Design a protein around this ligand. Structure first.
Ligand SMILES: *C[C@H]1CCc2ccc(OC)cc2C1=O
Ligand SMILES: [Co+2]
Ligand SMILES: [Co+2]
Ligand SMILES: [Co+2]
Ligand code: NA
Length: 262
């Protein structure tokens, strides 16, 4: 079943979600042409462990060897930090962080555009963030997840892009990936009504081309089948009595942390 978090659990998820957001805030000035993805991962890991006094949920998870996932251009998700892989002008890069603090998880990702942006990279990243935000604005008690996944898909396809169908958002708490699955597209299979105290992620992945993806031979890296660009943003939220509260908000977000309906 889906766990309802207690008020004390929610306070612990505020703290873990803030730490995760803070990793994304911190790492920004380091993202520039010529830096390696391995070095970015080391900086993040060292900050989580030594500064935040927390740990990466990603390190060792099902054997994963690094602390964050770093996904460039046509890599959709789960890109593996590599000391040999250097960023360059125009690259779009997702950094996905999940921190554990006091046994609670905070999970968030954002795109960075490296150096001189390309038109396509700027547009894809903006539409992706807007897809997340439109979903965030819908969350409240009594709505069905289906409606949220439908709204993301409608908006994205109207902008000429496609929604990746795997790798959905998820419940989160003391576990990293809990129920429910949070699909970012319309499915007749989806039927989950929200209630206050649920905690879950929304994390749409949007491809500039077609939706299909492929897992590479390293067993982790996922790429677009068509080699088009792919972008993603993620937040962790808690459902409140009248809306939701974003637990991984950053200073650069332009949506309020607390979304109230009435
Ligand atoms: C932490 C990061 C490692 C890579 C990976 C692969 C598959 C998966 O499925 C839920 C999650 C992850 C990660 O979260
Ligand atoms: Co300290
Ligand atoms: Co997630
Ligand atoms: Co994540
Ligand atoms: Na990408």
């Amino acid at each position: 079943a889906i766990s309802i978090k207690t008020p004390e659990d929610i306070e612990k998820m505020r703290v873990a979600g803030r730490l995760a957001a803070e990793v994304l805030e911190m790492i920004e000035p380091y993202v520039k042409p010529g830096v390696s993805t391995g070095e970015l991962d080391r900086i993040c890991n060292d900050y989580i462990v030594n500064e935040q006094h927390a740990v990466s949920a990603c390190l060792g998870y099902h054997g994963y060897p690094k602390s964050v996932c770093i996904s460039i251009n046509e890599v959709v998700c789960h890109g593996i930090p590599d000391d040999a892989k250097l960023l360059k002008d125009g690259d779009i890069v997702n950094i996905d962080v999940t921190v554990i603090k006091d046994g609670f998880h905070g999970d968030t990702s954002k795109m960075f555009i490296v150096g001189k942006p390309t038109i396509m990279g700027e547009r894809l990243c903006r539409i992706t963030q807007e897809s997340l935000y439109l979903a965030l604005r819908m969350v409240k008690p009594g709505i069905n997840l289906r409606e949220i996944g439908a709204a993301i898909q409608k908006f994205v396809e109207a902008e000429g892009f496609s929604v990746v169908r795997e790798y959905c958002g998820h419940g989160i708490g003391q576990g990293f990936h809990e129920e429910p699955q949070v699909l970012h597209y319309d499915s007749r299979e989806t039927n989950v009504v929200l209630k206050p105290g649920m905690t879950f992620t929304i994390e749409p992945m949007v491809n500039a081309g077609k939706k299909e993806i492929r897992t590479m031979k390293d067993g982790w890296t996922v790429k677009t089948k068509d080699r088009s660009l792919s972008a993603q943003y993620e937040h962790t939220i808690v459902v409140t009595d009248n809306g939701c509260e974003i637990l991984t908000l950053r200073k650069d977000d332009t949506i309020p942390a607390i979304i109230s309906h009435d």
